[PDB]
Design a protein around this ligand. Structure first.
Ligand SMILES: Nc1ccn([C@@H]2O[C@H](COP(=O)(O)OP(=O)(O)OP(=O)(O)O)[C@@H](O)[C@H]2O)c(=O)n1
Ligand SMILES: C[S@@+](CC[C@H](N)C(=O)[O-])C[C@H]1O[C@@H](n2cnc3c(N)ncnc32)[C@H](O)[C@@H]1O
Ligand code: SF4
Ligand code: NA
Length: 289
């Protein structure tokens, strides 16, 4: 039986940005009552979960960041999880949140696809109406101030495929720099009713390889081609259903809240060998960094 050692919980699909290739789109606004989410996290820890990553959607948009804060505190203080992380666009992370919850967060990943603001506009890394300026640098400084490990995520796509990020990554010094090839998921960023159309963003495997090669000097680089990314995550949706990506979509299992972890896991599509090959198990607790 596969142990769900590291699990992503996309607890909301709502987002304030509009990234054109987004593969986890705003198809619903449902969020579990926080006590139900805590019951799911408890049974995941009982099944062997050691790392949880909160995703979405934008995790800091829900309830002004209080929901993700409380889940981080619950997992660290009540479940004693070795690793608690978040992946965020960074735009809504505030100093008061960090002062309250940062001691419980091991790793904060901020997504940054370009250091060129025209490219970010083309991609949709922007809110409609008002906008923020240097959210990335301000969040990076908060991670140093509150002693959280800083991680950066980048999607290689048509509009950054020639970008040399070396000097910027050198300055930011992330502990881990994930570099994803833009990935198509039917019903998310392809398909008749999809909210996004990734076609204009996709790169060839070779263009992905050339972006990786350009940045091979950076020791923090963790590349994930489509092969390494598609099925190598345990992905719980906003109903705490595992999503199986093996068929090219995000096909949900029943909720662990109804059937338990082991039963739902059979329908996760998780490729544990690929999880290990891409570097999914790593030094992820802050005592060890
Ligand atoms: N087919 C896939 C593959 C991945 N993801 C999501 O893409 C994000 C990738 O972010 P990453 O930083 O790689 O997630 P972590 O699990 O925090 O990564 P790691 O533990 O390896 O640092 C995750 O939310 C994951 O669930 C997705 O929606 N669909
Ligand atoms: C859907 S996002 C959710 C968290 C937050 N909204 C953010 O963007 O960081 C999770 C991660 O997946 C990446 N991502 C989104 N769409 C992708 C795609 N089509 N292919 C590869 N990665 C993608 C994001 O950039 C981000 O690092
Ligand atoms: S990838 Fe962009 S649009 Fe998709 S959830 Fe993250 S910030 Fe929102
Ligand atoms: Na969609």
């Amino acid at each position: 039986m596969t142990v769900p050692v590291s699990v992503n919980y996309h607890f909301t699909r709502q987002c304030n940005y509009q990234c054109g290739f987004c593969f986890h789109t705003a198809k619903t606004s449902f969020v579990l009552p926080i006590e139900e989410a805590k019951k799911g996290l408890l049974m995941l820890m009982k099944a062997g979960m050691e790392k949880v990553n909160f995703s979405g959607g934008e995790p800091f948009l829900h309830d002004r960041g209080k929901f993700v804060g409380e889940l981080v505190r619950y997992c660290k203080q009540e479940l004693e999880l070795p690793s608690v992380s978040i992946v965020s666009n960074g735009s809504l992370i505030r100093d008061n949140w960090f002062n309250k919850y940062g001691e419980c967060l091991d790793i904060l990943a901020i997504s940054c696809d370009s250091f060129d603001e025209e490219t970010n506009v083309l991609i949709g890394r922007r809110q409609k109406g008002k906008n923020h300026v240097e959210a990335l640098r301000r969040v990076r400084d908060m991670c140093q101030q509150y002693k959280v490990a800083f991680k950066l995520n980048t999607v290689v796509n048509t509009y950054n495929k020639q970008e040399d990020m070396t000097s910027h990554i050198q300055e930011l010094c992330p502990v881990r720099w994930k570099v994803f090839q833009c990935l198509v998921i039917a019903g998310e960023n392809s398909g008749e009713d999809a909210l996004r159309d990734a076609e204009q963003f996709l790169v060839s495997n070779h263009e992905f390889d050339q972006f990786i090669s350009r940045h091979a000097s950076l020791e923090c680089l963790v590349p994930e081609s489509n092969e390494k990314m598609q099925n190598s995550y345990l992905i719980l949706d906003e109903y705490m259903r595992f999503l199986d990506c093996t068929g090219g979509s995000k096909s949900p299992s029943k909720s662990i809240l109804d059937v338990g972890v082991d039963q739902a896991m059979k329908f996760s599509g998780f490729d544990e060998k690929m999880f290990l090959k891409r570097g999914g198990k790593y030094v992820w607790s802050k005592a060890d960094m």
